[PDB]
Design a protein around this nucleic acid. Sequence first.
DNA 1: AAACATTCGTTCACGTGAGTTCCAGTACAAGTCTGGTC
Length: 57
Amino acid sequence: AAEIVPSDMYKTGCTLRFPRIEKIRDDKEWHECMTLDDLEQLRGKASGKLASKHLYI
DNA sequence: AAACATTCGTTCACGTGAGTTCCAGTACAAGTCTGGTC
């Protein structure tokens, strides 16, 4: 997703911008899902934008 | 004088380069489905 933005249609209080599926993980169990704490940490890490680090070459 | 070896023009098979047709991979563009909010 491009970023995480506030919303009122979802329980987490936030929704993704431009979401798309990259892979249906057949190796991850259901209990390995993200947690609200991790989502809050990711949201606060870079002001909601999911692109933080710098391209290198 | 008679027998054997060599040479020559011919013949066949097999291999390699250039032309033509057909199909797969690639590129791009448009269509279709979806997401989010105000």
